[PDB]
């Protein structure tokens, strides 16, 4: 699977960055696991079967083969490259794909 995410996004004044993360092709799966990693630290992770309930700074919705990610609480020091990881967990085969990363610019 090929994961696509935008090269660069600008966070809002209020520290909220939103961007899509999409995968292709659309293999049969019942459960997709999305992780946001910062370059490696784990920002948030969730399984879709509206997500990221274990992670107050992340939210997201999943349709078709595309997650609309929102990362909030960002400050200027949080500027950096945020990788999207997508897993097609079950039924097998398992598939994993890494995006090339979204550079998020945050201004205080």
């Amino acid at each position, epitope marked *: 699977i090929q*994961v696509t995410q935008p090269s660069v996004v600008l966070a809002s004044s209020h520290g909220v960055a939103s961007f899509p993360c999409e995968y292709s092709p659309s293999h049969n799966t019942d459960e997709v696991r999305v992780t946001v990693l910062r370059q490696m630290t784990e920002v948030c992770a969730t399984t879709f079967t509206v997500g990221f309930l274990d992670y107050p700074f992340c939210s997201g919705t999943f349709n078709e083969s595309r997650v609309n990610l929102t990362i909030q609480g960002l400050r200027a020091v949080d500027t950096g490259l945020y990788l999207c990881k997508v897993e097609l967990m079950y039924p097998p085969p398992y598939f994993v794909g890494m995006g090339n990363g979204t550079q998020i610019y945050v201004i205080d």
Partner: antibody
Amino acid sequence: QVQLVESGGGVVQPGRSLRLSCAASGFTFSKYVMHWVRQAPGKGLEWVTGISYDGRHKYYADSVKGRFTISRDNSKNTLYLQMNSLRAEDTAIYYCARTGWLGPFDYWGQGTLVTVSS
Amino acid sequence: EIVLTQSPGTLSLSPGERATLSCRQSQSVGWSPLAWYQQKPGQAPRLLIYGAFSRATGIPDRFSGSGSGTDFTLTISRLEPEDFAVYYCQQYGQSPWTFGQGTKVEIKR
């Protein structure tokens, strides 16, 4: 420091069962996919089985599906391989391996040897 | 299911020379989940490179990787005596996780 320590190997007769254990230390075990990989004498690496983060999803090589079962206990940070209906060709060094978050098998134990012989 | 074929079976070289090891994958998969491992006798495999070109932790700079689609290479720029070993490639983008058959890097005489 990341360490993985396998145990349980030994000599077993064809048809019987053996359970291997892998003790994980030095990382948050529940945040990684874990695997067993084996290497028969003089041969290369063969993935056997892997298990998702919370244990819900188990993946098997065709060669072992139906005979081997993988499980994990995230409270005591241990991975298991339940081997049944063992055969001569299952003789190998059995390694426990962690999947890095970016996908490769970034740490491996030293392995435990399983000999299946009459 | 992804099959990996490594070449040559054996690379024969001297310290200070360059090693180039090839790994060909059955299909392209939209990115490069291609890893390389070193293995010495009696020891477990060690991750060297992942994502085709990223070095793993503590791996010397003389190890590099390149490639995309179906064709990948591991380069040891200037071989050291500690590098004579067997090298495996692996695809980790989908189950079953699969490996190449290995390339032995031996001393040439």
